[PDB]
Amino acid sequence: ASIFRCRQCGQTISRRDWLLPMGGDHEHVVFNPAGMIFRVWCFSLAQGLRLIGAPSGEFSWFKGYDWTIALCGQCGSHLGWHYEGGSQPQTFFGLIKDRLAEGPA
Ligand SMILES: O=C1CC[C@H](n2nc3ccccc3n2)C(=O)N1
Ligand SMILES: [Zn+2]
């Protein structure tokens, strides 16, 4: 269990090696304004996504970061968000853990 794929279609998304401890933890449990709870895992890098729209700062769970919706580039499943416009690091991915499948390289 080293690679993360899209749970719906099996698109290659990220690696356990690429987990990023933002504020001391890679896992952040967050709620959106619609009251949906997400278990978000922070990654330095991801692939196989499609980033939709222009960045927005509204309701950002990570101070100083603007977000873009990250879909699976293959099946269009909402996998999380790309974050940018911040510092150390400038950019990262917040992916919804339960929408990924972990398995061998
Ligand atoms: O960091 C983030 C990413 C985006 C996320 N968010 N989900 C929404 C659903 C409906 C309307 C606005 C919304 N904002 C959020 O709350 N925070
Ligand atoms: Zn997919």
Question: Residue 103: in which H helix or E strand, if any?
Answer: strand 100-103
Q: How far apart are the two ends of the chain, measured CA to CA in Å?
A: 8
What's the resolution in A?
A: 2.0
Taking the CA atoms of 72, 76, 79 and 84 in sequence, report the sign of the dihedral they define.
Answer: positive
Going by CA atoms, what residue is nearest to atom 16 of ligand 1? 32
Counted residue by residue, the chain has a size of 105
Q: Where are the domains of the chain?
A: 1-105
Tell me the C-alpha distance between 28 and 55, whole Å.
20
Tokens 């919706």 correspond to 69
The approach used to solve this structure was X-ray
Question: 3-class DSSP state for residue 102?
Answer: strand
Helix (H, G, I), strand (E, B) or coil at 18: helix
CA–CA separation, 84 and 93 (whole Å): 9
- Centre of ligand 2 to C-alpha 57, Å, is 26
Q: How far is CA 46 from CA 3, 70, 102, in A?
A: 11, 10, 14
Residue 44 Cβ < 6 Å to ligand 1:
no
Would you call the peptide bond into 33 cis, given omega within 30 degrees of 0 as the criterion?
Answer: no
| Ligand 1 center–CA 92 separation, angstroms | 16
User: For ligand 1, is residue 61 a contact (CB within 6 Å)?
Assistant: yes
Radius of gyration (C-alpha) of the chain in whole angstroms: 13
